[PDB]
Amino acid sequence: GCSTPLGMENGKIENKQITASSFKKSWWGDYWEPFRARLNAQGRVNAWQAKANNNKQWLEIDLLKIKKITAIITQGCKSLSSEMYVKSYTIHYSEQGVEWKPYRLKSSMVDKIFEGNTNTKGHVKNFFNPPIISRFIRVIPKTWNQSITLRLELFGCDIY
């Protein structure tokens, strides 16, 4: 099969491999850095939060080599009554990290909009049918509740 978690939660995907368009930095040292977006992460700062909530944000994961990505799971995060989570998003990919291609269904002429979370800790998994063969993956938030925030995991396998 090709459904092994690629390394977000377990740390195989190192901090250096995860970057973003921007990240929230609070007045009091809380940096919601891109590499904090790891499935089930707990703590004060436990997720990536964009610096600004707009249509120019993205979270990128560099798998270091071309792999087969079969699925993705996302979560949001919470702090009191403030529930943050991405409600829908598109996926972009690339073999070199330069020039990005949007994930599009065979039957569609527009970017595939993926249904995201409806709460802060619930896991919402989406399968790529067909799978993505690439090295870099970018989650492009389209809609969100309160603020753009993510915790995620990627699933797949190597190319053989």
XYZ file of N, CA and C in Angstrom:
480
model
N 0.860 -1.212 0.000
C 0.000 0.000 0.000
C 0.876 1.235 0.000
N 0.244 2.396 -0.084
C 0.958 3.665 -0.090
C 0.108 4.558 0.804
N 0.297 4.415 2.111
C -0.488 5.166 3.080
C 0.270 5.399 4.384
N 1.588 5.372 4.304
C 2.401 5.581 5.475
C 2.524 7.073 5.752
N 2.328 7.478 7.017
C 2.444 8.897 7.362
C 3.865 9.318 6.984
N 3.991 10.409 6.233
C 5.290 10.880 5.759
C 6.256 11.548 6.739
N 5.797 11.889 7.941
C 6.716 12.479 8.900
C 6.411 13.790 9.590
N 5.188 14.303 9.480
C 4.860 15.563 10.152
C 4.750 15.357 11.660
N 3.919 14.405 12.070
C 3.728 14.121 13.487
C 4.943 13.483 14.154
N 5.582 12.520 13.488
C 6.739 11.857 14.093
C 8.064 12.622 14.003
N 8.085 13.682 13.200
C 9.283 14.487 13.070
C 10.267 14.107 11.979
N 9.977 13.052 11.216
C 10.865 12.641 10.127
C 11.026 13.793 9.159
N 9.952 14.560 8.983
C 9.976 15.746 8.139
C 10.474 16.820 9.113
N 11.737 17.205 8.969
C 12.354 18.180 9.859
C 11.843 19.590 9.674
N 12.026 20.408 10.706
C 11.586 21.799 10.694
C 12.000 22.556 9.444
N 13.250 22.386 9.032
C 13.772 23.062 7.844
C 12.978 22.786 6.557
N 12.307 21.638 6.498
C 11.530 21.251 5.323
C 10.147 21.909 5.243
N 9.728 22.580 6.312
C 8.419 23.221 6.334
C 8.552 24.739 6.420
N 7.999 25.425 5.423
C 8.050 26.884 5.347
C 6.660 27.428 4.982
N 6.465 28.742 5.087
C 5.168 29.335 4.755
C 5.309 30.733 4.212
N 4.214 31.244 3.655
C 4.179 32.592 3.097
C 4.477 33.595 4.206
N 4.030 33.268 5.416
C 4.239 34.106 6.592
C 3.745 33.341 7.812
N 4.000 33.887 8.993
C 3.526 33.274 10.223
C 3.302 34.341 11.287
N 2.328 34.102 12.156
C 1.995 35.031 13.222
C 3.084 35.009 14.288
N 3.460 36.204 14.719
C 4.469 36.408 15.738
C 3.780 37.367 16.705
N 3.447 36.891 17.903
C 2.772 37.731 18.891
C 3.736 38.710 19.560
N 3.170 39.729 20.206
C 3.960 40.737 20.912
C 4.736 40.121 22.054
N 4.365 38.905 22.430
C 5.018 38.246 23.540
C 5.623 36.903 23.178
N 6.604 36.939 22.280
C 7.329 35.746 21.863
C 6.667 34.492 21.299
N 5.356 34.494 21.105
C 4.704 33.316 20.550
C 4.852 33.372 19.034
N 5.611 32.437 18.478
C 5.815 32.392 17.039
C 5.129 31.132 16.529
N 4.045 31.311 15.786
C 3.297 30.189 15.236
C 3.950 29.800 13.917
N 5.206 29.371 14.013
C 6.012 29.007 12.857
C 5.463 27.853 12.041
N 5.765 27.838 10.732
C 5.303 26.791 9.811
C 5.550 25.367 10.323
N 6.731 25.122 10.888
C 7.057 23.797 11.410
C 6.285 23.366 12.662
N 5.386 24.213 13.149
C 4.567 23.871 14.310
C 3.293 23.136 13.854
N 3.017 23.169 12.550
C 1.821 22.541 11.969
C 1.872 21.009 11.900
N 2.087 20.379 13.050
C 2.194 18.933 13.131
C 0.969 18.310 13.804
N 0.391 17.310 13.145
C -0.798 16.604 13.640
C -0.722 16.317 15.140
N -1.797 16.648 15.850
C -1.937 16.421 17.291
C -0.971 17.179 18.191
N -0.207 18.126 17.654
C 0.727 18.877 18.491
C -0.019 19.594 19.614
N 0.556 19.545 20.813
C -0.025 20.182 21.987
C 0.883 21.321 22.437
N 0.368 22.180 23.307
C 1.177 23.271 23.811
C 0.668 24.660 23.499
N 1.365 25.648 24.056
C 1.044 27.061 23.887
C 0.959 27.406 22.393
N 2.063 27.182 21.693
C 2.137 27.413 20.261
C 2.163 25.999 19.702
N 1.045 25.568 19.134
C 0.955 24.212 18.622
C 0.497 24.112 17.171
N 0.581 25.207 16.424
C 0.142 25.176 15.031
C 0.743 26.313 14.246
N 0.680 26.205 12.925
C 1.147 27.283 12.070
C -0.045 28.223 11.980
N 0.214 29.518 12.084
C -0.831 30.522 11.939
C -0.233 31.533 10.990
N -0.991 31.893 9.962
C -0.529 32.880 8.994
C -0.462 34.247 9.691
N 0.420 35.121 9.213
C 0.557 36.453 9.790
C -0.675 37.267 9.420
N -1.180 37.040 8.209
C -2.360 37.733 7.703
C -3.337 36.728 7.106
N -4.628 36.949 7.324
C -5.648 36.049 6.786
C -6.124 36.555 5.442
N -5.508 36.081 4.369
C -5.893 36.506 3.029
C -5.677 35.387 2.027
N -5.818 35.705 0.741
C -5.669 34.718 -0.322
C -4.262 34.557 -0.887
N -3.262 35.023 -0.153
C -1.878 34.913 -0.599
C -1.063 34.035 0.355
N -1.746 33.255 1.190
C -1.062 32.396 2.153
C -0.860 30.966 1.649
N 0.171 30.312 2.178
C 0.497 28.936 1.832
C 1.469 28.334 2.825
N 1.342 27.030 3.031
C 2.215 26.271 3.918
C 2.844 25.257 2.981
N 4.164 25.230 2.947
C 4.891 24.336 2.059
C 5.679 23.269 2.799
N 5.639 22.061 2.254
C 6.364 20.937 2.817
C 7.268 20.363 1.723
N 8.569 20.339 2.009
C 9.572 19.814 1.093
C 9.898 18.409 1.556
N 9.489 17.415 0.774
C 9.736 16.008 1.099
C 11.166 15.552 0.750
N 11.968 16.490 0.252
C 13.362 16.268 -0.128
C 13.582 15.460 -1.406
N 12.573 14.702 -1.829
C 12.639 13.918 -3.064
C 11.227 13.654 -3.569
N 11.106 13.318 -4.848
C 9.806 13.036 -5.435
C 9.223 11.767 -4.826
N 8.032 11.901 -4.258
C 7.339 10.793 -3.617
C 5.919 10.722 -4.150
N 5.171 9.747 -3.657
C 3.772 9.562 -4.033
C 2.949 9.969 -2.813
N 2.178 11.038 -2.946
C 1.350 11.517 -1.855
C -0.085 11.069 -2.129
N -0.624 10.281 -1.209
C -1.953 9.720 -1.363
C -3.040 10.357 -0.520
N -2.664 11.041 0.551
C -3.664 11.676 1.400
C -3.081 12.757 2.293
N -3.980 13.537 2.883
C -3.623 14.619 3.784
C -4.689 14.730 4.873
N -4.254 15.068 6.082
C -5.162 15.288 7.205
C -4.828 16.666 7.792
N -5.848 17.451 8.121
C -5.623 18.757 8.724
C -6.457 18.903 9.997
N -6.024 19.813 10.864
C -6.684 20.170 12.128
C -6.450 21.670 12.252
N -7.193 22.305 13.145
C -7.014 23.725 13.393
C -6.364 23.805 14.767
N -6.755 24.782 15.573
C -6.230 24.908 16.929
C -7.160 25.815 17.714
N -7.093 25.743 19.041
C -7.980 26.512 19.917
C -7.271 27.131 21.126
N -7.845 28.216 21.650
C -7.321 28.897 22.832
C -8.460 29.698 23.445
N -9.225 29.031 24.306
C -10.398 29.595 24.977
C -11.540 29.401 23.981
N -12.377 30.417 23.794
C -13.480 30.329 22.846
C -13.005 30.609 21.421
N -11.734 30.972 21.277
C -11.184 31.269 19.966
C -10.771 30.001 19.240
N -11.636 29.586 18.323
C -11.433 28.401 17.518
C -10.953 28.815 16.140
N -9.787 28.327 15.746
C -9.240 28.658 14.442
C -9.083 27.383 13.636
N -9.385 27.460 12.346
C -9.242 26.313 11.459
C -9.511 26.683 10.008
N -8.860 25.975 9.093
C -9.051 26.190 7.665
C -10.245 25.320 7.249
N -11.256 25.958 6.670
C -12.470 25.278 6.237
C -12.374 24.622 4.854
N -11.587 25.210 3.959
C -11.400 24.652 2.625
C -10.068 25.164 2.091
N -9.466 24.405 1.182
C -8.167 24.778 0.637
C -7.880 24.073 -0.680
N -6.902 24.591 -1.419
C -6.473 23.949 -2.657
C -5.074 23.407 -2.382
N -4.569 22.565 -3.274
C -3.246 21.979 -3.111
C -2.415 22.258 -4.357
N -1.186 22.716 -4.158
C -0.264 22.991 -5.259
C 0.934 22.081 -5.040
N 1.600 21.684 -6.117
C 2.768 20.818 -5.984
C 3.837 21.180 -7.004
N 5.053 20.704 -6.764
C 6.189 20.983 -7.633
C 7.318 19.975 -7.410
N 8.077 19.706 -8.466
C 9.204 18.783 -8.393
C 10.492 19.478 -7.949
N 10.603 20.774 -8.239
C 11.805 21.541 -7.915
C 11.576 22.627 -6.878
N 10.327 23.037 -6.699
C 10.035 24.081 -5.734
C 9.843 25.406 -6.440
N 10.083 25.397 -7.747
C 9.910 26.571 -8.593
C 8.866 26.082 -9.576
N 7.898 26.940 -9.880
C 6.781 26.599 -10.761
C 5.885 25.618 -10.025
N 4.696 26.093 -9.682
C 3.732 25.296 -8.951
C 2.537 24.942 -9.804
N 2.099 23.699 -9.685
C 0.955 23.221 -10.436
C -0.171 22.948 -9.440
N -1.395 23.403 -9.743
C -2.510 23.159 -8.823
C -3.099 21.760 -9.028
N -3.568 21.152 -7.944
C -4.169 19.832 -8.035
C -5.528 20.035 -8.690
N -5.731 19.348 -9.801
C -6.962 19.489 -10.544
C -7.466 18.107 -10.945
N -8.767 17.881 -10.784
C -9.343 16.601 -11.157
C -9.313 16.469 -12.679
N -9.268 15.229 -13.150
C -9.249 14.946 -14.580
C -10.487 15.572 -15.213
N -11.592 15.509 -14.479
C -12.861 16.034 -14.945
C -13.094 17.529 -14.741
N -12.096 18.269 -14.260
C -12.302 19.693 -14.008
C -11.263 20.659 -14.555
N -11.740 21.845 -14.915
C -10.882 22.886 -15.452
C -10.494 23.915 -14.378
N -10.895 23.653 -13.135
C -10.570 24.537 -12.021
C -9.887 23.743 -10.916
N -9.143 24.455 -10.076
C -8.432 23.861 -8.949
C -9.405 23.111 -8.048
N -8.997 21.924 -7.614
C -9.823 21.109 -6.733
C -9.873 21.743 -5.352
N -11.074 22.108 -4.919
C -11.271 22.694 -3.599
C -11.504 21.540 -2.628
N -10.620 21.394 -1.649
C -10.738 20.339 -0.654
C -11.490 20.815 0.578
N -12.392 19.973 1.077
C -13.156 20.306 2.268
C -12.283 20.077 3.494
N -12.072 21.148 4.255
C -11.233 21.103 5.439
C -11.955 20.836 6.742
N -11.468 21.449 7.815
C -12.033 21.235 9.141
C -13.307 21.992 9.438
N -14.023 21.530 10.457
C -15.260 22.161 10.909
C -15.126 22.474 12.402
N -13.955 22.190 12.957
C -13.667 22.442 14.362
C -12.157 22.524 14.524
N -11.690 22.663 15.761
C -10.260 22.808 16.049
C -9.361 21.581 16.213
N -9.904 20.448 16.649
C -9.043 19.286 16.797
C -9.456 18.066 15.990
N -10.642 18.103 15.406
C -11.094 16.968 14.624
C -10.231 16.780 13.393
N -9.942 15.524 13.063
C -9.132 15.186 11.898
C -10.012 15.080 10.665
N -9.661 15.799 9.600
C -10.397 15.704 8.340
C -9.373 15.233 7.308
N -9.574 14.018 6.806
C -8.680 13.405 5.837
C -9.244 13.442 4.422
N -8.406 13.819 3.465
C -8.804 13.858 2.063
C -7.807 13.002 1.301
N -8.317 12.156 0.413
C -7.481 11.281 -0.403
C -7.271 11.901 -1.777
N -6.061 11.775 -2.308
C -5.761 12.295 -3.632
C -6.023 11.187 -4.632
N -7.096 11.330 -5.402
C -7.471 10.352 -6.419
C -7.537 11.066 -7.762
N -6.461 10.996 -8.564
C -5.266 10.170 -8.403
C -4.247 10.795 -7.461
N -3.279 10.001 -6.988
C -2.250 10.506 -6.074
C -1.360 11.566 -6.727
N -0.606 12.276 -5.900
C 0.306 13.307 -6.388
C 1.720 12.746 -6.377
N 2.432 12.915 -7.480
C 3.812 12.470 -7.573
C 4.568 13.783 -7.673
N 5.252 14.136 -6.595
C 5.978 15.389 -6.555
C 6.870 15.419 -5.326
N 7.622 16.503 -5.164
C 8.528 16.654 -4.031
C 8.014 17.665 -3.011
N 7.465 18.773 -3.505
C 6.929 19.824 -2.638
C 5.407 19.861 -2.694
N 4.796 20.132 -1.547
C 3.347 20.230 -1.432
C 3.045 21.554 -0.726
N 2.051 22.276 -1.226
C 1.645 23.531 -0.623
C 0.158 23.476 -0.352
N -0.228 23.806 0.874
C -1.635 23.854 1.255
C -2.009 25.335 1.083
N -2.982 25.623 0.221
C -3.403 26.995 -0.041
C -4.784 27.228 0.587
N -4.829 27.858 1.773
C -6.116 28.115 2.437
C -7.041 28.995 1.598
N -8.307 28.605 1.506
C -9.293 29.362 0.745
C -10.317 29.980 1.676
N -10.793 29.200 2.644
C -11.749 29.695 3.633
C -11.292 29.226 5.007
N -11.632 29.993 6.030
C -11.231 29.673 7.386
C -12.199 30.256 8.410
N -12.106 29.751 9.627
C -12.929 30.233 10.711
C -11.985 31.030 11.597
N -12.276 32.320 11.723
C -11.502 33.249 12.537
C -10.114 33.566 11.994
N -9.259 32.559 11.881
C -7.912 32.781 11.382
C -7.358 31.517 10.733
N -6.393 31.704 9.835
C -5.761 30.594 9.130
C -4.792 29.908 10.084
N -5.077 28.648 10.390
C -4.238 27.881 11.284
C -4.331 26.407 10.898
N -3.203 25.704 10.990
C -3.134 24.299 10.617
C -2.192 23.451 11.428
N -2.532 22.172 11.449
C -1.757 21.090 12.037
C -2.091 20.037 10.990
N -1.092 19.318 10.490
C -1.376 18.345 9.448
C -0.444 17.154 9.397
N -0.812 16.210 8.539
C -0.029 15.015 8.273
C -0.254 14.652 6.807
N 0.793 14.137 6.177
C 0.742 13.726 4.790
C 0.941 12.214 4.796
N 0.339 11.519 3.839
C 0.479 10.067 3.740
C 0.885 9.704 2.321
N 1.691 8.657 2.195
C 2.130 8.227 0.880
C 3.219 7.183 0.942
N 4.135 7.251 -0.014
C 5.244 6.305 -0.093
C 6.264 6.795 -1.108
N 7.370 6.072 -1.219
C 8.408 6.421 -2.177
C 7.980 5.986 -3.572
N 8.699 6.493 -4.565
C 8.469 6.143 -5.960
C 9.429 4.975 -6.158
N 8.982 3.927 -6.840
C 9.823 2.751 -7.062
C 10.091 2.488 -8.545
